[PDB]
Symmetry: C2
Amino acid sequence: MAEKALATLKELAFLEDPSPVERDAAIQRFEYTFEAFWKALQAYLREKEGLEGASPKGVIRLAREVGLLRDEEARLALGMVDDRSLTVHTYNEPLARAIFRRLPDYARLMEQVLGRLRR
Amino acid sequence: MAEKALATLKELAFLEDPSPVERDAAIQRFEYTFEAFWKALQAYLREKEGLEGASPKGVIRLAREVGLLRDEEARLALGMVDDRSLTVHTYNEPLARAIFRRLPDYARLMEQVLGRLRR
C-alpha cells in the first residue's frame, strides 16, 4: 500500500496554509502511509537481507545498518515514529500544526526510500 | 477537553456526503476524541468509583458494571475500540467508509456518556 497511500498524503502534505480539516486529514493519511511504509521496509529487510525487525524503530535501525537509510534519513525516520505516537493527541492546534510542519520531509523521505526498494 | 475534542468531531461526523478530505479528517477526529473519551472515563472511575482500569476495553467494561453504560452502549463502545485501531491501514476505502458510517452513533454515544460523568 506504501506508494499509493503516499500519493494521497502528498496531496495535502505540501499545502502552504491548510484549513483545520485538511490538516487533520493530512495527519490521518500520514498515519496509514507510515504503517504501510515500515511494513514494506520490514518485508524487504526480511526477504532481501534476511534481517528481522519487529517494531518500526527496530526496522529503521536495520534499514540504517544495511544502508537503505543514510544516518540522517534514519534519524528523520525515528522522528517519524515518535510523531506517529503523537497523532492521537492532535486535538491541540499546536501539536497538530507542529506535526503538519514535518509532513513535507516525511513524504519525501518515504517516497525516496520506497524507490530504492525496487529490488 | 473530551467535550471539546468531541465538539470538533461533531462538525464532521454528520455529513451525508463528505469529500475524501472531510472523511479522513472525521476519522482522525474520531481517533483523538475516543482517546480523550476513554481517558476521561478512566479518570472518572478512578476518582469517583474507586475502580482503576488500565485499558480502553477494561475501562468500558467497568463503566458498564457501574451503571454508566447500558449493555447496548457498552457493546457499541467496544466496537469503537476495534475501529480506532483499524483506523491504521485506512486508505482501504471500504474500511474508512464503514467507520465514517458509524461516526454518527459513536459521536452521539460519547456525548451521552460524557453527559453522565457530570450531571
